[PDB]
Amino acid sequence: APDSVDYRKKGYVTPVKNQGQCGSCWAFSSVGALEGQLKKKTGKLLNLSPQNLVDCVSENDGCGGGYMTNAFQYVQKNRGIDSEDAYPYVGQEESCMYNPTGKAAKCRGYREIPEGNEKALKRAVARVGPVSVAIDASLTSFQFYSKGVYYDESCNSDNLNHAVLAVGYGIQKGNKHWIIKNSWGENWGNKGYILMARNKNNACGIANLASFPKM
Ligand SMILES: *C(=N)CNC(=O)C1(NC(=O)c2ccc(Cl)cc2N)CCCCC1
Ligand SMILES: [Cl-]
Ligand SMILES: [K+]
């Protein structure tokens, strides 16, 4: 795999979104990974519907939380996911309003990265595109990130509580990193992004629950 890659530069990544008060990070993570695959497959990028996911993925708990893999499976079995335009984000769990004729993407399943394996995560990012990941995002030091490569030893890689999207990886002043898209809006972190430590013993659990959709 290459030393560095940044899918934002290849047009695979939509603007940073803001999930608001709803615990729908899983839906944003999911749609980000689906948006990458859409671009790679069709050459066109479009915002996909996180609300579609929050409302219709019955095996998840809406604004209470969810798994990305459940969302991919939903899209696969549903034969589609709506665009954000067709099914806008409202930030509370409502009745399912999916319309097949507003579908903007499909999914033929999903693959999971071997647990803890940052080298396999690197290879997935390099070869696939953006990958959904879960992390411990509970620390004040994460919440108030502004610059640099984030590393805090008190992060608990076994305490996953947030889902985000790995859109690349690189190195900054010998500190290898992952390029992470959050869903806390553009006024969070560095215009909505955080550089997280790569190859520092799976810092924050970055490679513990990674997956991507197949299209
Ligand atoms: C995002 N704002 C909150 N975090 C999550 O949703 C994560 N999943 C869960 O908390 C979770 C998963 C599955 C069910 Cl059915 C219910 C819940 N609450 C945090 C763990 C990592 C993946 C996302
Ligand atoms: Cl419903
Ligand atoms: K990390």
Side-chain angles (χ1 to χ4, degrees):
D3 288 348
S4 64
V5 75
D6 189 345
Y7 282 106
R8 303 169 294 187
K9 296 313 219 304
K10 296 151 201 219
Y12 280 47
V13 183
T14 65
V16 168
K17 305 307 186 319
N18 194 334
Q19 64 189 252
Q21 299 290 114
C22 172
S24 57
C25 60
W26 63 265
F28 288 87
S29 178
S30 300
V31 297
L34 289 158
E35 289 159 353
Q37 291 314 284
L38 182 62
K39 166 69 189 192
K40 180 167 186 198
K41 179 165 202 180
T42 67
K44 311 230 138 179
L45 190 66
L46 214 59
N47 288 327
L48 298 171
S49 177
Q51 198 62 57
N52 187 172
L53 303 181
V54 164
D55 298 349
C56 308
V57 183
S58 57
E59 288 265 1
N60 283 343
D61 193 21
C63 295
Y67 285 127
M68 304 74 82
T69 52
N70 294 341
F72 306 139
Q73 186 133 93
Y74 163 73
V75 172
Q76 183 174 27
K77 294 308 194 276
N78 195 60
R79 305 163 298 115
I81 184 171
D82 292 337
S83 72
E84 169 70 28
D85 286 326
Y87 198 153
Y89 184 67
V90 306
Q92 30 200 310
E93 179 187 357
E94 306 190 328
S95 73
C96 182
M97 303 155 220
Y98 171 81
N99 189 328
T101 70
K103 78 182 68 69
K106 290 168 162 193
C107 173
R108 25 164 328 258
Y110 66 90
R111 296 282 308 165
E112 297 172 288
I113 285 63
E115 180 178 17
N117 194 333
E118 285 185 273
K119 196 181 283 203
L121 180 59
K122 185 191 172 177
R123 170 181 173 88
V125 175
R127 296 185 77 79
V128 159
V131 176
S132 295
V133 298
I135 54 169
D136 180 6
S138 67
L139 290 178
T140 300
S141 48
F142 180 92
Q143 295 170 22
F144 286 91
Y145 172 89
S146 66
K147 273 176 167 179
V149 176
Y150 176 74
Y151 178 69
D152 186 328
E153 202 199 354
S154 62
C155 224
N156 181 352
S157 62
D158 301 309
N159 178 26
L160 305 175
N161 50 56
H162 188 50
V164 290
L165 181 69
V167 300
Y169 63 79
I171 190 164
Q172 193 194 75
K173 300 158 144 207
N175 300 298
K176 281 169 176 196
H177 62 68
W178 300 106
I179 307 177
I180 300 302
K181 190 183 194 195
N182 202 346
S183 57
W184 288 356
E186 292 183 308
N187 308 297
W188 179 78
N190 186 358
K191 309 198 163 174
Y193 285 85
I194 178 167
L195 302 184
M196 300 183 73
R198 174 165 60 91
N199 288 353
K200 287 201 78 95
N201 209 356
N202 193 27
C204 288
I206 190 76
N208 278 357
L209 201 62
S211 63
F212 57 87
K214 302 174 287 174
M215 278 185 190

